[PDB]
Amino acid sequence: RDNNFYSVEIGDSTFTVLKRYQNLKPIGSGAQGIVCAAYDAILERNVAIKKLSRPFQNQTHAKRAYRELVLMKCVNHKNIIGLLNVFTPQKSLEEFQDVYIVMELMDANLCQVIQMELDHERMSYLLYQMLCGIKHLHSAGIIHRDLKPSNIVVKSDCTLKILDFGLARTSFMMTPYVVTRYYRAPEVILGMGYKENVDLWSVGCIMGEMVCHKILFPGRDYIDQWNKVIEQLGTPCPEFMKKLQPTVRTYVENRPKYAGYSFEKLFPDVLFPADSEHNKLKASQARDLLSKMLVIDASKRISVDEALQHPYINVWYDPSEAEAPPPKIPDKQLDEREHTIEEWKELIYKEVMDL
Ligand SMILES: O=C(Nc1ccc2n[nH]c(-c3ccncc3)c2c1)[C@@H]1CCN(CC(=O)N2CCN(c3ccc(-c4ncccn4)cc3)CC2)C1
Ligand SMILES: [Mg+2]
Hints:
Structural class: alpha+beta
Radius of gyration: 22 Å
Helix content: 25-40%
Strand order of the largest sheet: 3-4-5-7-6
CATH architecture of the largest domain: Orthogonal Bundle
CATH superfamily of the largest domain: Transferase(Phosphotransferase) domain 1
Distance between the termini: 19 Å
Shape: globular
Order of helices and strands: EEEEEHEEEHHEEHHHHHHHHHH
Largest sheet: 5 strands, antiparallel
Bound molecules: the ligand O=C(Nc1ccc2n[nH]c(-c3ccncc3)c2c1)[C@@H]1CCN(CC(=O)N2CCN(c3ccc(-c4ncccn4)cc3)CC2)C1, magnesium ion
Strand content: 15-25%
Number of helices: 13
């Protein structure tokens, strides 16, 4: 029971885990906690274990932990990281501190894949899977808004899973950890409203980085971010500027003007396989897809369904993946809850125990 746990030091943290999980080794860490690889001696396979330390300690951590528990439980899709187990070593609501989330173990992070040249077959398949995951979230009313390579993982067989569920409908932390903002859409950067295709901008940024092996828009803050976007893509049209509130419009209209670059110049043939006629045609199609994702004005940007149907992508199309029954989310206030620390503590404990 309590004797069915053991503890090991993992860097500056203590992991206290069920004895079924053996041979822990750190594989990543972030604002939310440390993740280890482990061998599950019962399943006879390796797994990933994330430790959430006092996730109820503030509202930002708490909302994310609670929503991720609920979503991981109700979602079952091959391109979304799946839940294998959840436990706490503490034996009561009173003593509760930590949550451990056990997931499928993948082979690499997409940041490592970005450092490799990819053939069109692998590149298109990875993008196809991203799009299936995103569409599946959208089908349940979940718009991610913060898709990024660090939170996407892959196997050697080119299978891909998204690790997180995004920004909900909402962030200050005392932390040395820094939020990666490079993939966020113009309507996020400028504080505009958004719709489902906010996520397609991020897919564009990821695709473009897979192709050129550089972060497209590495801004140090949102002002820098916007400059980098307009330097490459060009100052947006007046029809876009008109959609901005005056405080933001005066700012956007008063930046120096940029012509931008064609997509042929941003993503030349030398960045793609382009020897054979097959590869030439695929390079053309890839560039066309990029040109439809990396569109500042969201009203003119590709949708998930148009991307799934695009010639570069549609060779993979399978409605069991792309038209799967939507997740059924049981907490109808999932994105709107406001709670005290003590309230979030009880809500999370109950999720963990199933209570
Ligand atoms: O890692 C996290 N969560 C999970 C969860 C379940 C998992 N299942 N399987 C894996 C897995 C990951 C990596 N390798 C094998 C398996 C999981 C990871 C958390 C989520 C947030 N986080 C990732 C993160 O933000 N990172 C920063 C970027 N980083 C990174 C950056 C550059 C390179 C790199 N590699 C080669 C060349 C150049 N750069 C590699 C990793 C990866 C960790 C920690
Ligand atoms: Mg991360």
